[PDB]
Amino acid sequence: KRFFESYHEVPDGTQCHRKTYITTALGGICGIIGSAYSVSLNPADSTLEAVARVGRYTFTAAAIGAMFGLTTCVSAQVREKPDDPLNYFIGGCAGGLTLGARTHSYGTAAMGCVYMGTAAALFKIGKLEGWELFPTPKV
Amino acid sequence: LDLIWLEKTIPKSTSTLHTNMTTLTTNQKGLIKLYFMSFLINIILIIILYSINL
Amino acid sequence: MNPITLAIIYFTIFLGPVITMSSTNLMLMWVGLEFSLLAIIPMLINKKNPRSTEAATKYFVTQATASMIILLAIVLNYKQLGTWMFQQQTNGLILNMTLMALSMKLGLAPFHFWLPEVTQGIPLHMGLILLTWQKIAPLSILIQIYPLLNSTIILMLAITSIFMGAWGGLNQTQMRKIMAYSSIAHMGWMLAILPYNPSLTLLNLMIYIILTAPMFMALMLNNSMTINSISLLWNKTPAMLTMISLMLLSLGGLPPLTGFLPKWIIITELMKNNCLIMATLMAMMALLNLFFYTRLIYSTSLTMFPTNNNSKMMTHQTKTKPNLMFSTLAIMSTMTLPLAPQLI
Amino acid sequence: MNNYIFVLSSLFLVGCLGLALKPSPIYGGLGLIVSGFVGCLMVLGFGGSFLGLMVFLIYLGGMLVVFGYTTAMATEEYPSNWLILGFLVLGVIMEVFLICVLNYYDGDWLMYEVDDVGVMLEGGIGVAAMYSCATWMMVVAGWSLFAGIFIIIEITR
Amino acid sequence: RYGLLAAILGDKTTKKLHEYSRVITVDGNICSGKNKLAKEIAQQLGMKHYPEAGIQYSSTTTGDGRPLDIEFSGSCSLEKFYDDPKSNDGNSYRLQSWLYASRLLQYADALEHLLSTGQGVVLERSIYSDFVFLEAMYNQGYIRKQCVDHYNEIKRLTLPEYLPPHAVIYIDVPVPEVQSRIQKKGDPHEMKVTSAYLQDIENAYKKTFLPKMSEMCEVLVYDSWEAEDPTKVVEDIEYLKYNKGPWLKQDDWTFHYLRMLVQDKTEVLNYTTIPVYLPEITIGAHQGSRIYNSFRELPGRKYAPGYNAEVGDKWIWLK
Amino acid sequence: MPSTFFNLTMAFSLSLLGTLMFRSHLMSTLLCLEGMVLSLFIMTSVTSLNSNSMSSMPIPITILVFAACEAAVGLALLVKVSNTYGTDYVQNLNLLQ
Amino acid sequence: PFLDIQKKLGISLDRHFMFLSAEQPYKNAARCHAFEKEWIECAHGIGGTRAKKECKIEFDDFEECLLRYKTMRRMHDIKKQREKLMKEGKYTPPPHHSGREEP
Amino acid sequence: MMNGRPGHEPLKFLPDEARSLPPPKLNDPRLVYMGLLGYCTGLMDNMLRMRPVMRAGLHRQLLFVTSFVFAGYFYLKRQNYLYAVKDHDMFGYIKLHPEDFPEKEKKTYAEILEPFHPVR
Numbered sequence A: 001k002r003f004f005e006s007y008h009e010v011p012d013g014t015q016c017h018r019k020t021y022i023t024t025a026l027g028g029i030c031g032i033i034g035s036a037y038s039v040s041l042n043p044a045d046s047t048l049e050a051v052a053r054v055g056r057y058t059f060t061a062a063a064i065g066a067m068f069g070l071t072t073c074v075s076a077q078v079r080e081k082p083d084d085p086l087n088y089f090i091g092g093c094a095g096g097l098t099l100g101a102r103t104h105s106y107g108t109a110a111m112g113c114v115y116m117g118t119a120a121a122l123f124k125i126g127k128l129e130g131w132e133l134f135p136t137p138k139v
Numbered sequence B: 001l002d003l004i005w006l007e008k009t010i011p012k013s014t015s016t017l018h019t020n021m022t023t024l025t026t027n028q029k030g031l032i033k034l035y036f037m038s039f040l041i042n043i044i045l046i047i048i049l050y051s052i053n054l
Numbered sequence C: 001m002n003p004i005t006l007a008i009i010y011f012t013i014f015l016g017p018v019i020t021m022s023s024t025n026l027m028l029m030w031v032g033l034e035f036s037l038l039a040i041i042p043m044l045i046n047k048k049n050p051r052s053t054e055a056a057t058k059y060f061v062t063q064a065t066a067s068m069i070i071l072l073a074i075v076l077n078y079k080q081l082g083t084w085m086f087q088q089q090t091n092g093l094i095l096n097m098t099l100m101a102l103s104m105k106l107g108l109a110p111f112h113f114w115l116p117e118v119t120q121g122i123p124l125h126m127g128l129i130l131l132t133w134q135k136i137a138p139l140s141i142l143i144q145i146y147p148l149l150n151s152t153i154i155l156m157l158a159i160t161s162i163f164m165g166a167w168g169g170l171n172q173t174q175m176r177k178i179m180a181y182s183s184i185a186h187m188g189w190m191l192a193i194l195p196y197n198p199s200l201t202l203l204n205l206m207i208y209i210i211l212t213a214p215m216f217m218a219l220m221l222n223n224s225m226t227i228n229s230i231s232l233l234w235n236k237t238p239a240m241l242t243m244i245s246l247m248l249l250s251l252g253g254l255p256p257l258t259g260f261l262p263k264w265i266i267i268t269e270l271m272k273n274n275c276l277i278m279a280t281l282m283a284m285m286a287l288l289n290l291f292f293y294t295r296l297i298y299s300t301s302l303t304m305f306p307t308n309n310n311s312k313m314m315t316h317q318t319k320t321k322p323n324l325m326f327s328t329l330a331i332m333s334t335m336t337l338p339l340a341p342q343l344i
Numbered sequence D: 001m002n003n004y005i006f007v008l009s010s011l012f013l014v015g016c017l018g019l020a021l022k023p024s025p026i027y028g029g030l031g032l033i034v035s036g037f038v039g040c041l042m043v044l045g046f047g048g049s050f051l052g053l054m055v056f057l058i059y060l061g062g063m064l065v066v067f068g069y070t071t072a073m074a075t076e077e078y079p080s081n082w083l084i085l086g087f088l089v090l091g092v093i094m095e096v097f098l099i100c101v102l103n104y105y106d107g108d109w110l111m112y113e114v115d116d117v118g119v120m121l122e123g124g125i126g127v128a129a130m131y132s133c134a135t136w137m138m139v140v141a142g143w144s145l146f147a148g149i150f151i152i153i154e155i156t157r
Numbered sequence E: 001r002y003g004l005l006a007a008i009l010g011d012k013t014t015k016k017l018h019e020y021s022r023v024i025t026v027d028g029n030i031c032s033g034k035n036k037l038a039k040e041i042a043q044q045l046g047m048k049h050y051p052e053a054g055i056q057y058s059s060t061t062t063g064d065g066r067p068l069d070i071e072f073s074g075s076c077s078l079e080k081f082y083d084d085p086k087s088n089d090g091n092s093y094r095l096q097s098w099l100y101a102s103r104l105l106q107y108a109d110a111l112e113h114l115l116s117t118g119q120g121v122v123l124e125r126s127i128y129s130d131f132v133f134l135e136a137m138y139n140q141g142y143i144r145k146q147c148v149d150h151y152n153e154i155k156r157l158t159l160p161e162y163l164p165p166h167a168v169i170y171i172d173v174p175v176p177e178v179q180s181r182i183q184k185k186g187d188p189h190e191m192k193v194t195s196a197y198l199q200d201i202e203n204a205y206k207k208t209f210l211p212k213m214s215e216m217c218e219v220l221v222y223d224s225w226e227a228e229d230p231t232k233v234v235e236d237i238e239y240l241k242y243n244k245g246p247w248l249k250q251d252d253w254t255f256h257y258l259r260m261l262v263q264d265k266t267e268v269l270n271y272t273t274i275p276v277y278l279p280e281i282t283i284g285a286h287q288g289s290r291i292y293n294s295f296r297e298l299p300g301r302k303y304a305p306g307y308n309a310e311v312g313d314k315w316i317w318l319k
Numbered sequence F: 001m002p003s004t005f006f007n008l009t010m011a012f013s014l015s016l017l018g019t020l021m022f023r024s025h026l027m028s029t030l031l032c033l034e035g036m037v038l039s040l041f042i043m044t045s046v047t048s049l050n051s052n053s054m055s056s057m058p059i060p061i062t063i064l065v066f067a068a069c070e071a072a073v074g075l076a077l078l079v080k081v082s083n084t085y086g087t088d089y090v091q092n093l094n095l096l097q
Numbered sequence G: 001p002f003l004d005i006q007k008k009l010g011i012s013l014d015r016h017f018m019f020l021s022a023e024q025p026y027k028n029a030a031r032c033h034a035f036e037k038e039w040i041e042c043a044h045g046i047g048g049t050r051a052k053k054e055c056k057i058e059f060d061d062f063e064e065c066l067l068r069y070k071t072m073r074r075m076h077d078i079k080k081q082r083e084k085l086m087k088e089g090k091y092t093p094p095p096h097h098s099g100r101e102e103p
Numbered sequence H: 001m002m003n004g005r006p007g008h009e010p011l012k013f014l015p016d017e018a019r020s021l022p023p024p025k026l027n028d029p030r031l032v033y034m035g036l037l038g039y040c041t042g043l044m045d046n047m048l049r050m051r052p053v054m055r056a057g058l059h060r061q062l063l064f065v066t067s068f069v070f071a072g073y074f075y076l077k078r079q080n081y082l083y084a085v086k087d088h089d090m091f092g093y094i095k096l097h098p099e100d101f102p103e104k105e106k107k108t109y110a111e112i113l114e115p116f117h118p119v120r
Ligand SMILES: CCCCCCCCCCCCCCCCCC(=O)OC[C@H](COP(=O)(O)OCCN)OC(=O)CCCCCCCCCCCCCCCCC
Pocket: C238, C239, C241, C242, C245, C246, C256, C301, C302, E302, H047
């Protein structure tokens, strides 16, 4: 776990390799989990068919992970701005686009871009403003 | 811009996004085995959620 | 049912939650849970229709394995602390088990599959008990142990439930299952504030009970398990159309009615505790719940669906009345909001 | 003997492994019956004579028998236990390998502590506490049995 | 009221049953003289003789009991049934569906009298013997296939709950006989009933109804000659042994629940109003709302029995 | 018990994995379900015995008494199912979809 | 607990036997009875939030009377290294292992 | 929360300490609301049971308006206490742990210099 966290430690826009790798893993992990629920429920017809679906979901998710990581990191270096939430939006923007492609739908890319990017941007803001998620009870 | 573009984007899209999401989450075989394994998956993930955030 | 059996069962279904609540020795809390499991199964198959046996056999397996997991937590604690009860020191995994298990008996989040299906095959009456006098028991166990449970998991099960409940409800047209889905959702809010302010869980429950109990006795007054069936309410009994309208919008969070308070104070408590991430997303999809509530509103009240000639016959005959509880629980529920400060 | 217990514990896991792979339900009957034998012995290793014979007496022949009993009456329509044995054998070995992991890293503390000069030490005096100083466990167990007779007739009808 | 409380303390149908206490229906063709046989059998054992179910039987059942206006009673005409078969509006199916609801009310009222008083009941035609009219109507152009399915669905949903007729006295008089019998009591409408339709009614009686109830209940058939001799038929009923049938298992604690059902008319026909939208059955919201505002405004109906002052109810301010 | 309470615990998890993944006959679950109660009974009895905590021995048995009835209910449902569907096979239990 | 019908009614059907130091039959004291007392008379009047930091000496000890793992560890080490000393033929079990014994 | 407080009455409704607090005026708007809340319950019942809405059950109407109100005085009497305990508890802590809740000096605006954003 010390791993994933690393993504945040080094300043954004720097060491994109590690960023992309980490982001790709998270997506892939989600892919596995997502495929699992998708196979446990709404099962397949043959073991192979399901192994394929696991692969499909895993790769698609890994891809959205990569492009998000790559776009955000690169957008940063190029723009010479490491804390501009927009960076992430461009990244989320891209991530959605990959999802759209893997689903072969321009429309999905639309919602995907907006919704996904917005979400990622909010993550950046969240980190920048020190928003706390799942907080301990401090009443 | 009125009618189609400003109705397909904000009002209608949100209509579709959900409609589609309910279709996947609610299309369930009804068989117990499937459902139960999903309980298995959950136990596994929660076991981990605790593990990694030990 | 030989009235004697009816008494023994009903006593057990009622001694079941009460032992849980009163005792402190967890073991005695477990058997309280066990007695509830044994007592409910006979009533569930009263019609003994093919759907029913399916319902009970699912409810029982889901309930039984969860009961065994809760016992394992108590057995493990016994070896990590000689005590028969969770303490500050308790290993975190020990408590998380209890959360998952108890979240299965209550049917929250990723374990929300059994409830909608058992709510579909049981009568409207036993539906109420299965939804509201069987949630008191497990919740008691959680509320007692709140200081120790994890804020992260609860929140995830909370948010998930809200979403699953909402999304599931949108598609459903069977009423029993629309309610099952709502209960999953409300149950979610309840478990969201447990780690922070248990006292509000007990409000978000009572209000749910004071809202759902009138709503179901409404569904059965005409015994309609279909929206199409509840839509012809205007012909079968016109007066309940007014309050059915407000109670369902009350079940969702719309502001003038009593239903806003549970969501409002839960949001106030979560923001007081800084979960302005979590609280926001919950409130937003909470709005999805009202959409399916209002879609039913449309069919039952705001628009008059076509009815059948044979209905004129049912009008002629005197309609067996709805118990008094309906009224007292419809009003105390639809409009108590002006009295919120004292409720909390 | 040596590791008189670990061995047994290992057998308990093995039996339950069988049940988990859902052997044919009356081939699975033994699975429990035999581990139940194993667990009977285990508790009899820590000096728990009464509790140990209590299971052998109740879960072994009372609960489990009745199970298979019904297992034959109903659900006797069965077409792979061999396949199961395959996984059983492999998993059993995998279980061993896992222990071999402890060999890589991490009994003198079996019976733990006792009162050597004593009478009124035997386990089983405790179970009788249901009547003195623990008479609420006894009543609730009694209500469950009384409820069971009424509940089952109502389930069966 | 009747409830577990009453049942717990006595009030058991078990203590109120006697040999003469049975559900006996007599079924025949459009004119089997069953009306006569019924009254007599009734006179013999003091059996409450229920009249055949009518369009306004429910109105006579409820409140004042004065006959309701046709549209208030579901707008059904047996008269129009005959003069306009295969009508565009489908009055014939609406007539049949209202008839099934009426006998459902009659059968339930009969069972309530049987379990409370203990007296038996002769109900002439019953929900059990209604299908023959629909079978003949579908065999003819009168009703279409789905119409049949809708009636069958209502029948499957409601009829099983009620216990079967103990015995089902039956008359038979060949189609020629009935047509001729029609001519004697002259009525333009009843007169124009295509024989083949009468052929289909009796047929469905003999081929499907007569045997079907023969296992579950005592079917005794009586040719016309045996008929018109209530004494003999009555004698035979008193002769048959009420053994074979589902009635054997009706213990007191089982009857209680059945009683509480018939005790609630709103439930008896709960499934009679199922929201299946076949076009003939549909009230329609605008027409239905008007008929309701108008049926509900009739004196003594605007409020529950006992509370409407128009008909002379008093003490409303303390009820 | 340090590693003798890990075998029993994993036995309960192996029994856990069992009850949660069904396959054909329902009896095998119920039967499995019982495998847990045995593992819980054995573990409760074991620690109570090496803690010399005699005040708690009542529990090891209360666990069995409640588990037995629990199973009684479970089997009556099972008999009810192979009376309505002629088999205990779970697939049949898919009407509530 | 959630509804204290027990304290109110004064009855104690469920409290007398919750800890190892409760009355054991025939007064056969449990094990770790030397500590649980010391760890619950400490945390009495002090709520949990403060029964978890300052009364940590008594739980760290009671976590060792029962689990008795540090002992297991120490001893295991003694065993392993003794194996190594025997390995170097340095050590041999004393006649204590086979010698005249006390009554 | 407030449970676990010293002296807590384990199952009591309103401890006698609540005697010290003023009793709720019977005409307190709230109790009067409960009254109206009640009358409506009554009227609603009549309606759902199809009775003359206002002219029926004039005995029940009273039971309702008088049951709800009765409940109120004794509930409000308590909720009032609970809130009053909250202050006793809250104010006390502010003192017993004074340093944590220190009095602050607020510089007269003359001294403080909030920046001025011009609208222009
Ligand atoms: C906080 C304010 C919230 C909003 C307040 C105003 C809206 C209240 C909620 C209304 C919701 C339902 C709307 C649609 C109802 C449709 C009813 C209908 O179609 O009519 C039939 C119905 C039953 O007819 P029936 O009474 O049996 O006929 C008797 C014949 N002798 O006819 C009836 O049911 C008649 C009786 C209806 C109940 C009376 C409603 C009166 C209006 C209530 C206003 C409350 C104002 C509160 C203001 C608060 C300010 C802070």
